[PDB]
Symmetry: D2
Subunit: 385 residues, 4 copies
């Protein structure tokens, strides 16, 4: 199960380069030079990398240090053939962002957050990124009175509408993806799920420039079904990007490697992405645990990819299995894909078979045969057919 660049696997620089600092402990690993991560990931078979501004250029770097960092990184991309499909901004680490960036109560901070983002959009475009992610990790509150949410949503829409004016006036071909998270590091984060992000999009001045970048474990932090959410984002035509990882239930953000956490959910996610022809990057936003040395970091990264390809093969087997096709029919999945009333409203109202003469008892008595189907899915997932 060997990845190739045609699999479009990507990694954040902050992923394999996580040092292991957690709220109760110090770093357990040395910093990695982004050049060195690009080389190592290229060897493992990745397609590309992603970055926040501050991962690539140390906060408070001069225009000339900034130059030199970008040039070195550009050489590593040239030497390995790695691409940069997505970039993002850090509006969460520096103390100035303690109450948010775009929805900080202090106006001067909201202004600075905009300008910091605009500077990186330009960079992202120079390096060939097609999608620009926004994760408002600091947009939220620990207390009720601290954030008037309606005002916050105004400010949030104001910032996104301004980004969108910028990119339109510059003629850039970059689209935006909002990344929802329900909590952590704030007590409650604004736009906490895929639905909240999707709803909010529809209120921007130019909605066609914005989609979502949902993350497996974030939605699972609210106990939601991640494939269902992704199906809703696909149905809206808004799945611009996706972050893949693992989460063991409702608890702090674990960012385990893909396939770890809820495995069956990983299976139905891959089945969905592949059957709906999602063609974007398969981006891993994971942290190798702080128990690991560098060898462990590379093994965790490889494991991400391996588990995708294994789950890709089993889901493909599932759907090609004639016995599965027969069960899908037994379960009336085919009828679900037929319109309920293509005949129209009037015809429905005049059709006695839909009400006055509908046999509710006999309809009630039909089993759905879902358990047989789900065990077929289990046997395929475990390679036990």
């Amino acid at each position: 199960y060997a990845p190739t660049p045609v699999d479009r696997f990507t990694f954040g620089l902050w992923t394999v380069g996580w040092q292991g600092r957690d709220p109760f402990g110090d770093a357990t690993r040395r910093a990695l030079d982004p050049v060195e991560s690009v080389r190592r990931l290229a060897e493992l078979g990745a397609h590309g990398v992603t970055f926040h501004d501050d991962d690539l250029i140390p906060f408070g770097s001069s225009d000339s240090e900034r130059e030199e960092h970008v040039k070195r990184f550009r050489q590593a991309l040239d030497d390995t053939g790695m691409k940069v499909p997505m970039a993002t901004t850090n509006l969460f680490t520096h103390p100035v962002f303690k109450d948010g960036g775009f929805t900080a109560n202090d106006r001067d901070v909201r202004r600075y957050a905009l300008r910091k983002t605009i500077r990186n959009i330009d960079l992202a475009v120079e390096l060939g990124a097609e999608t620009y992610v926004a994760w408002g990790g600091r947009e939220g509150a620990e207390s009720g009175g601290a954030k008037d949410v309606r005002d916050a949503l105004d400010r949030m829409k104001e910032a996104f509408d301004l980004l969108g004016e910028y990119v339109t006036s510059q003629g850039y071909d970059i689209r935006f993806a909002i990344e929802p998270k329900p909590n952590q590091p704030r007590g409650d984060i604004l736009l906490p799920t895929v639905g909240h992000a999707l709803a909010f999009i529809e209120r921007l001045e130019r909605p066609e420039l914005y989609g979502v970048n949902p993350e497996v474990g974030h939605e699972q932090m609210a106990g939601l079904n991640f494939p269902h959410g992704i199906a809703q984002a696909l149905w809206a035509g808004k799945l611009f990007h996706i972050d893949l990882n693992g989460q063991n239930g409702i608890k702090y953000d674990q960012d385990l490697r893909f396939g770890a956490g809820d495995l069956r959910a990983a299976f139905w996610l891959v089945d969905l992405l592949e059957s709906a022809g999602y063609s974007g990057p398969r981006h891993f936003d994971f942290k190798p645990p702080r128990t690991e040395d560098f060898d462990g970091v590379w093994a965790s990264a490889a494991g991400c990819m391996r588990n995708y390809l294994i789950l890709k093969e089993r889901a493909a087997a599932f759907r090609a299995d004639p016995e599965v096709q027969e069960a899908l029919r037994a379960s009336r999945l085919d009828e679900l894909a037929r319109p309920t009333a293509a005949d129209g409203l009037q015809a429905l109202l005049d059709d006695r078979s839909a009400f006055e003469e509908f046999d509710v008892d006999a309809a009630a008595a039909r089993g759905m045969a879902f358990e047989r189907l789900d065990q077929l899915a289990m046997d395929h997932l475990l390679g036990a057919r």
Copy 2:
């Protein structure tokens, strides 16, 4: 703290009339006649009641029994002055709806679910209802392969678009509210939160006819902040109705009386509804616990109202308190309500005070003073000023 009908408190017939059957136990109370609940609630000071079809007219009633039930109920409404501001359909109890109504895999069942809903919309309009709620409690799955979600969302949009054609072609002044629930009785329910419902609305053919009816405990079943959600629904102009109740965290749907559960959340909810001028009904969808006899059912109902009025008084006190106004200013809530860049994009980009000469350290150092504000909110909530 005495309710009056001008408080617009309402109750579902199914609330006080819950018999106490739970998945592990039999009824502990006798059935109540809807006439008797209307009278008792009128005495307690309620404004009105709501109903599913099947609460009012026993499933499988003739056209003439249906007549007689409606006439008796109409007399009780006339005798007490009670209104019926909202109605809804039961598409969840009968076995025929075991895989859903609008998104059942079997097409014939989807058709019947539509016709059952249309019959009640007419009734609801006769009785003066302004809002028609849809709670798709059976729309969902326990397993991955049983429900193609994109197909399901098609079917769901098809049904709502058809309801909306019906009401438009009949000239009715009724609007629809979708009620989200994340799970139970299905393993995962479609449109599981306020955001998912809001997003979905925007894809209907006539969005202006549809809003949400969020329920305190449902959103809390996914660990979300309910006031934040309600602020988002208000911001979208979609809060058509609201169900009030209590939930003790992430667990089965408790439907405790309003004020029970997360009390501070009830406080910030009331503060929001009242400050934003929500003028709809204050509807309680609660179950008096199965430990209670009829006296207990009426005491629980009264408690719903009492807790609203107590939390209304304390939130009003909070916001009128000059020391609170000073703290809100200390916390820069006023600046949050100012546009980040009314000057426009170009002016922002040319303003050196927003970046090149912005003093990040001194901005970083300013405290937000949120803890002082939140303790003011606590002292007001507890009457300890």
Copy 3:
């Protein structure tokens, strides 16, 4: 992957005989005659069945109907070779138990609950049961003031101590297992987890008669790791029985078939049970979903067993894999099984290599190699070696 009676698979009568009544819906299946379930499960390869009193003998049956029910059931057990290794009492369905059985506030109800249990212990002993389970599903509260917990725990210990006097004075060879559940149908249930049950046991007059019967999904309802809990119960020598099933996170009790829910957790559970030589029954307390007809009920039951045997084979493969043995050593699992200080306290204190001359940095730098090991476990689980 075919079960045999030597696999010791058992089923509750209430499992396959669940009619599908949930809090929002009516039955979707007809009642099954216990004789018919015994025959069908014997065919599927089960070893035995379990029962509450009230599943076997309808509540309010005469001494003579009681006779006739027991005799018919005894014939089915004789005809099929099925055993009854566990029994239990229903102290949760009848209205009289609305505030509990053993910890009801009303004393007369606590007395009746004892006598109802004692009558069934005798029956259980006649039918050859070795373990008698207690699930206090109604012992708890929705509100703070309703249950003085210290008093409740007195009452709870009083009842168990009385059961234990009864069985000792009768000379029965039956042991008791407490089954923890954190909530549902009460807002909070007493002894909500495995640990709480284990702790409580140690306060009974004869602790050696009582262990736990933990259930996969119950512990997962509190977000706990179920294999860790089971390891603690094994370590205490208290795993007398176990209920196997599936749960998709923190939400209502789903009781999905074994292997559904958190699959990786099912894998590490089976690896534990098998490596520690648990020899008790492998008992499924699941509900076939209400979407299913009778064929679906039997397919769900078979699936329970199949998934156990598949996960048994993969865990066995994992532990026999020399590359896994090498990784376990690489991860110092062997050193974990060595005493930290067999040399004793004084020797530890005098050993400079443990402190004054311990090289913390070089110890810090060693990776644990856990990610490589966990991917080996993943490849074995998926059959991808």
Copy 4:
């Protein structure tokens, strides 16, 4: 509502001295000198402080720097009258503890963890501490195969048994309290709840030396009822210490000030502690949010105390209220405190009123009147009588 030292309020040095570093951000506050925190808290009315070793003496300090730090701290305690009732060890921050201290897989690390703890027990005893807390924040795993739990529990019991030999052989009057946490920073922590800790205690060689130090938000991280847990620990006679704070449901460890989070739970906690005569310290383990400057840190600390005293007054009012006493009787709380069968087993079995002639229907019909009682509790909590 002014605290005095007779209220026995304490604070960890790490609480008010938290700098605000979270997993996604840098410090927002400067470090505080422990001398300065002792003075400021004494002014606010606290009784005392607690410390980990490493809060007081920087890790890697010489024997002489260690001397000088302790002497300065001792002077501040002398100047203010502050006591040190509890101490603890940091076995979680340094990289060496990445896989735990007492249950690290590497034996040499387990040895060092013991010696680091023993050195501080001596210090704690010199400063007058009566309780020594152990929080095994790093004892656990992210993956199944990394930690054999039975072996881990051996190691855990080995370490505690060794601590207990040390203190017994030195003649110290210090007792140990284990502090449970279900997760974070590990994926699952060993002894994740109050019950698991209580159960484990009973397996130590000298159980009478060990109790629990439960923390409000930790138990709430598993969705448990914290007052119920504390009632169980009191019932076992093991509540040696308690950490008070606030948590908004199942999510990362928030450590909000006491009274924030689940307010009603804070109320029933205080009602319990006060009615059962808990005489230990009322210790706050909270973090002032990172939004706050130093003024905010002191306001948050004061708020902790204020909310305790306000909830102390309301619970006291509740229980003295003759109408509440009447309701408690109406709800048969008095009967719950009476033995179920002081008459004994034989008398129960011979008492026909307990079974053959027990009127189950009439018992079933009695309401428990719990909702009236709970609204009395609400009116008292809000000062609305």
